[PDB]
Design a protein around this ligand. Structure first.
Ligand SMILES: CCCCCCCCCCCCCCCC(=O)OC[C@H]1O[C@H](O[C@@H]2[C@H](O)[C@@H](O)[C@H](O)[C@@H](O[C@H]3O[C@H](CO)[C@@H](O)[C@H](O)[C@@H]3O)[C@@H]2OP(=O)(O)OC[C@@H](COC(=O)CCCCCCCC[C@H](C)CCCCCCCC)OC(=O)CCCCCCCCCCCCCCC)[C@@H](O)[C@@H](O)[C@@H]1O
Ligand SMILES: CCCCCCCCCCCCCCCC(=O)OC[C@H]1O[C@H](O[C@@H]2[C@H](O)[C@@H](O)[C@H](O)[C@@H](O[C@H]3O[C@H](CO)[C@@H](O)[C@H](O)[C@@H]3O)[C@@H]2OP(=O)(O)OC[C@@H](COC(=O)CCCCCCCC[C@H](C)CCCCCCCC)OC(=O)CCCCCCCCCCCCCCC)[C@@H](O)[C@@H](O)[C@@H]1O
Ligand SMILES: CC(C)=CCC/C(C)=C/CC/C(C)=C/CC/C(C)=C/CC/C(C)=C\CC/C(C)=C/CC/C(C)=C/CC/C(C)=C/CC/C(C)=C/CC1=C(C)C(=O)c2ccccc2C1=O
Ligand SMILES: CC(C)=CCC/C(C)=C/CC/C(C)=C/CC/C(C)=C\CC/C(C)=C/CC/C(C)=C/CC/C(C)=C/CC/C(C)=C/CC/C(C)=C/CC1=C(C)C(=O)c2ccccc2C1=O
Ligand SMILES: CCCCCCCCCCCCCCCC(=O)O[C@H](COC(=O)CCCCCCC[C@@H](C)CCCCCCCCC)COP(=O)(O)O[C@H]1[C@H](O)[C@H](O)[C@@H](O)[C@@H](O)[C@@H]1O
Ligand code: HEC
Ligand code: HEC
Ligand SMILES: CCCCCCCCCCCCCCCC(=O)O
Ligand SMILES: CCCCCCCCCCCCCCCC(=O)O
Lengths: 223, 102, 146, 26, 51
C-alpha cells in the first residue's frame, strides 16, 4: 500500500529520527542502523514498548506501548521497504497470528526450551541475571506473536535463532511450552515465586521457626 | 575392593589404549576418521542427531553441537539406541558453536 | 556506573547479516552477497549478486565497484541525491541498479571476501560476507541404523 | 600465578583445507 | 512352526506370537517380545501322541 507507507514515515520523523537517522543509517553512539532488520524487529520493539528508548544504560527496559496496531503496522511496513528482512506471521484474515502459532507437541517444545532457553531464563520462564546490570526478563506477559518474534530477530544480548537453525515448526512448540508453563496452577500449595531453595528457606525461617519459638515462649516461663 | 587405578589405559584411540581423562567423544578412533558436528533436533525415536551446514547459523547466533559418526545414526534399532545415549551423556562432549559478526 | 561515557547499549551493532563500513562522506549498510549454494563451493563461471544501501547526509556522488573474485558489473543511474539514498540490491522481503559478479574464483559461505567500493571522492575495502535470507532449511538425506 | 602454555600470538593463520577422510579403519 | 516339526513322543514349549511384533531389532519390538516372554500365563506345552 502506498498510502500506508507515507503514514508510517511521518510517525518516524517525529519519534525515531533522533537516534536512528533520517535515512535509517544510524546516529553514531546514540543508536544503530535500521537497514535489513525488517518488520519483525519493529513489531517486537514497539509492541512491547522497548522503542522508543529514553536514555543509554546497561539495558533498555520494557514499558507501556506508545503506538497501537495500525501505527505499528505502518512503522513496520515503512522499515521493511528499506532493506527487507524478517516479517511477522499473519493469519487468514490479514491480522497478526496468535492462535495459529501454538504447536501440538509440548514435550518436544519443553526439551528444546530446556536446552536452548533455560540457561538465561529459568526452568519455567522466570528471570535470570546477566553480566553487569543486564538480565533476562519474565516470559509470563508475552503473547504468541511476541514470543515468536523475540527469537527470530535477537533483541539484545539474547542470540538470534534463524529459520534454518530453529525451523518455524519447532518455534511453535517452544511458544506452546512457554504459554502453557505460565498458566498452569501450582500443585501442592502456593508457588513461592518458582525459584526454589531461597524462597523456601526464607519461608521456613520467617514462618515455621517464628511459630515454633512463639509457642515455646507461650508454654515456657521467663527470667 | 573399591580402590581403582585412574591412570589405566582403557579407551581405544588412533594411538593405542589411553586413560579416561585424556580422551573425549572428539578423539579420533582411527587416522582420518570423520567426526560430524550434529545438533539435537527431534525425539529419541526420530533420529535425535542430524548434520549441519555453515549457512544454518547467522551472525550473533550460537548452537550446541555433539560429535556424531556415520557408524551410529537414527537410533531406530537397539544397537544404535545405546550409541546415541553415550553421545548425549558424555561429560566432555558438548560444544558451543558461535558465529561472529564480520 | 552503567550510564557513563562507556555505555553497553549505544555501541551495539545491528544484527543484519552484513557489514556497515564507512567511506568518504558515504555510509554503506547491509552489504552482502547472494549466491544460493548447493555444495561445498559455488564454482567459477556462475554469476552472483551484490546488495547494499549507500547513504549520505548532504549533493551527488558517482561510484564503481572492483574486486578480485571475478569482475563486478553495474547497471543503473548509480548516483546519490542530497537527503536520499541509493538502493542497489533488493534482498528477499522487499515488496533500479544491479551489481553482478562473474566470480572467477570459487566462494563459500562462512568466509569473508574483499570488495573495493570506489566513489568520485572516496574509496574503501569492505571484506563482505555471504548471507542467505528467507530461504528455508535445505533437506538432509536420512541416515541408516549404522 | 599465570598458567604456562596460555599465551597470545601475532601469527596470521591460514584457512583450513577441505576434509577428505581416510575410507575405512586402518 | 509346522506340525511336521514334532516327532511322535516329543514335547515343545510355545508362546503366543503375532505378525505385529516380530524381529525384535527395533526398541518397540524388543519391548513387545520381552512382554510376551515374561507373561505369567503365556507358556504352553505342545505334545504329539503316538497313533
Ligand atoms: C503454619 C502456617 C503455614 C502455612 C502458611 C501459608 C499461607 C500462604 C498462602 C496460603 C495458602 C493457600 C493455598 C492455595 C494455593 C492456590 O490456590 O494457589 C494460587 C496461585 O498463586 C499464585 O498465583 C498468582 C496469580 O493468581 C496468578 O494469576 C499469576 O500467574 C501468578 O504469577 C506468578 O507467575 C507469573 C508467570 O506468568 C509471574 O509473572 C509472576 O511474577 C508470578 O511468579 C501469581 O503469583 P504471586 O505473585 O505469587 O501472588 C502473590 C501472593 C503473595 O503471597 C504472600 O502473601 C507472601 C507469603 C510469603 C511471605 C514470606 C516472605 C519473607 C520476606 C522477608 C520479610 C524479607 C525481609 C527480612 C530479611 C532481612 C531482615 C532485616 C531487616 O498473593 C497476591 O497475589 C497478593 C498478596 C495477597 C496474599 C496475602 C495472604 C497471606 C499474607 C500473610 C500476612 C497477612 C497480612 C495482610 C496481607 C494482605 C501462583 O503461586 C500459582 O502457582 C498458584 O496457583
Ligand atoms: C568519599 C569521600 C572521599 C573523597 C574521595 C573520592 C570522591 C570523588 C572522587 C572520584 C573521581 C571522579 C569520578 C567521576 C568520573 C566518572 O564517572 O568516570 C568516568 C567514566 O569512567 C568509565 O571509564 C573510564 C574511562 O573513562 C575510559 O576512557 C576507559 O576506557 C575505562 O577503562 C576501562 O575500560 C576500558 C574499556 O572501555 C579498558 O580499555 C580499560 O582497560 C579499563 O578496563 C575507564 O574505566 P576504569 O579504569 O574502570 O576506572 C577508572 C575511573 C573510575 O571511576 C572512579 O572514580 C572510581 C569510583 C570509586 C571511588 C573510590 C571510593 C573510595 C572509598 C571510600 C572513601 C571508603 C568508605 C569509608 C567510610 C568512612 C568511615 C568513617 C570512619 O577513574 C578513577 O578511578 C578516578 C580516580 C579517583 C579515586 C580516588 C579515591 C582513592 C583514594 C583513597 C581516599 C580515602 C578517603 C579517606 C581515608 C582516610 C566510563 O565507562 C564511564 O563509566 C564513566 O563515565
Ligand atoms: C549479594 C549480597 C552480598 C547481598 C547484598 C546486596 C545488597 C546491596 C542489598 C540491597 C537490597 C535492597 C533492599 C535493595 C534496594 C535498595 C535499597 C532500599 C537499599 C538499602 C536501603 C537502606 C540502606 C535503608 C532502608 C532501611 C531498610 C531496613 C530497608 C529494608 C530492605 C529490606 C528489608 C529488604 C529485603 C532484603 C533482602 C536482601 C531480602 C532477601 C529475601 C529473599 C532472598 C527472598 C527471595 C524470595 C523471592 C525472590 C520470591 O520471589 C518470593 C516469592 C514469594 C514469597 C517469597 C519469596 C522470596 O522469599
Ligand atoms: C553462635 C556461633 C556461630 C558460634 C561461634 C563459635 C565459633 C566462634 C566458632 C568458629 C566457626 C567460624 C569460623 C564461624 C563461621 C560460621 C560459619 C562459616 C558457619 C558454620 C555453621 C554454623 C555454625 C551455623 C549457625 C548459624 C546460627 C547460629 C544462626 C542462628 C540464627 C538465629 C539465632 C536467628 C533466629 C531468630 C529468627 C527466628 C530470625 C528471623 C528470621 C531470619 C531473618 C533469620 C535469618 C536467616 C537465616 C539464619 C538463614 O539462614 C536464611 C536462609 C535463607 C533465607 C533467609 C534466611 C534468614 O533470614
Ligand atoms: C585408614 C583407612 C585407609 C588405610 C590405608 C592403609 C592402606 C590400605 C589400602 C591398601 C589396599 C591396596 C589394595 C591393593 C590392590 C592394588 O594394587 O590396586 C591397584 C593399584 O595399586 C596401588 O597403586 C596401591 C596404591 C594405594 C594408595 C591409594 C590409596 C589412597 C587413596 C586412594 C585413598 C583410598 C581410600 C578410598 C576411599 C573409599 C571410598 C569410601 C569412603 C589398582 O588395581 P586395579 O587396576 O584397579 O584392578 C583391580 C580391579 O580389577 C578390581 O575390580 C578393583 O577395582 C580393585 O581391586 C582393583 O585393584
Ligand atoms: C534514541 C534514544 C532512540 C530512539 C528515539 C529510538 N530508538 Fe530504537 N534503539 C535505540 C538503541 C540505542 C537501540 C539498540 C540497543 C537496544 O536494542 O536497546 C535501539 C534498537 C532498536 C531496534 C532493534 C534493531 C536491531 O535489531 O538491530 C528497533 C527495531 C528499534 N530500536 C526501533 C525503534 C523505533 C521504531 C523507534 C521510533 C519509535 C525508535 N527505535 C526510537 C535507540 C533509540
Ligand atoms: C541469554 C543471552 C538468552 C537466551 C539464550 C535466551 N534469552 Fe530470551 N531474552 C534474553 C534477554 C537478555 C532478553 C531481553 C531483551 C530485551 O528486553 O530487549 C530476552 C528477551 C526475551 C523475550 C522478550 C521479553 C518479554 O517480552 O518477556 C522473550 C519472549 C524471550 N526472551 C524468550 C526466549 C526464548 C523462547 C529463548 C530460547 C529459545 C530465549 N529467550 C533465549 C536472554 C536470553
Ligand atoms: C555520592 C555519589 C556521587 C556520584 C554519583 C554518580 C552516579 C553514579 C551512578 C551511575 O549510574
Ligand atoms: C590468605 C593468604 C592469601 C595469599 C594470596 C596469594 C596470591 C597468589 C596469586 C597467584 O598467582
Amino acid at each position: 500500500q502506498s498510502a500506508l507507507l507515507r503514514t508510517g514515515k511521518q510517525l518516524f520523523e517525529t519519534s525515531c529520527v533522533s537516534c536512528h537517522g533520517a535515512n535509517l543509517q544510524g546516529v553514531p553512539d546514540r543508536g544503530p542502523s535500521l537497514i535489513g532488520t525488517g518488520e519483525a524487529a519493529v513489531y517486537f520493539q514497539v509492541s512491547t514498548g522497548r522503542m522508543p528508548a529514553m536514555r543509554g544504560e546497561a539495558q533498555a527496559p520494557s514499558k507501556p506501548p506508545h503506538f497501537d496496531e495500525s501505527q505499528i503496522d505502518a512503522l513496520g511496513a515503512y522499515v521493511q521497504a528499506n532493506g527487507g528482512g524478517p516479517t511477522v506471521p499473519r493469519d487468514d484474515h490479514g491480522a497478526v497470528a496468535q492462535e495459529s502459532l501454538i504447536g501440538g507437541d509440548v514435550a518436544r517444545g519443553g526439551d528444546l526450551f530446556r536446552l536452548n532457553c533455560a540457561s538465561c531464563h529459568n526452568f519455567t520462564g522466570k528471570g535470570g541475571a546477566l553480566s553487569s546490570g543486564k538480565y533476562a526478563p519474565d516470559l509470563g506477559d508475552a503473547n504468541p506473536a511476541q514470543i515468536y518474534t523475540a527469537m527470530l530477530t535477537g533483541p539484545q544480548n539474547m542470540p538470534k535463532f534463524s529459520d534454518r537453525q530453529l525451523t518455524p515448526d519447532e518455534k511453535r512448540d517452544i511458544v506452546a511450552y512457554v504459554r502453557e508453563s505460565a498458566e498452569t496452577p501450582s500443585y501442592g500449595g502456593y508457588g513461592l515465586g518458582g525459584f526454589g531453595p531461597a524462597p523456601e528457606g526464607m519461608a521456613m525461617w520467617i514462618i515455621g521457626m517464628v511459630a515454633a519459638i512463639g509457642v515455646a515462649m507461650w508454654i515456657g516461663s521467663r527470667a | 575392593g573399591l580402590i581403582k587405578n585412574p591412570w589405566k589405559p582403557v579407551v581405544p584411540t588412533a594411538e593405542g589404549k589411553k586413560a579416561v581423562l585424556w580422551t573425549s567423544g572428539w578423539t579420533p578412533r582411527f587416522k582420518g576418521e570423520t567426526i560430524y558436528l550434529a545438533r539435537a533436533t527431534g525425539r529419541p525415536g526420530e533420529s535425535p542427531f542430524v548434520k549441519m551446514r555453515p549457512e544454518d547459523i547467522d551472525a550473533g547466533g550460537m548452537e550446541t553441537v555433539f560429535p556424531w559418526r556415520e557408524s551410529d545414526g537414527d537410533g531406530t534399532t537397539v544397537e544404535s539406541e545405546h550409541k546415541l545415549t553415550e553421545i548425549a551423556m558424555g561429560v566432555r562432549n558438548p560444544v558451543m558453536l558461535i558465529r561472529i559478526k564480520p | 556506573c552503567s550510564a557513563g561515557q562507556i555505555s553497553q547499549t549505544t555501541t551495539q551493532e545491528p544484527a543484519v547479516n552484513g557489514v556497515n563500513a564507512q567511506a568518504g562522506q558515504v555510509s554503506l549498510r547491509n552489504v552482502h552477497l547472494r549466491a544460493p549454494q548447493q555444495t561445498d563451493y559455488v564454482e567459477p563461471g556462475t554469476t552472483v549478486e551484490l546488495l547494499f544501501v549507500a547513504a549520505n547526509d548532504s549533493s551527488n556522488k558517482l561510484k564503481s565497484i572492483t574486486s578480485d573474485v571475478g569482475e563486478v558489473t553495474l547497471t543503473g543511474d548509480s548516483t546519490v541525491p542530497a537527503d536520499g539514498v541509493l538502493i542497489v540490491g533488493e534482498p528477499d522481503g522487499q515488496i533500479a541498479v544491479t551489481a553482478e559478479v562473474e566470480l572467477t574464483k570459487p566462494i563459500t559461505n562462512g568466509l569473508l571476501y574483499d570488495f573495493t567500493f570506489t566513489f568520485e571522492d572516496g574509496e574503501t575495502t569492505v571484506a563482505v560476507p555471504i548471507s542467505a535470507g528467507e530461504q528455508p532449511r535445505r533437506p538432509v538425506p536420512p541416515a541408516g541404523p549404522g | 600465578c599465570s598458567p604456562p602454555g596460555e599465551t597470545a600470538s601475532s601469527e596470521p593463520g591460514t584457512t583450513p583445507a577441505i576434509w577428505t577422510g581416510s575410507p575405512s579403519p586402518a
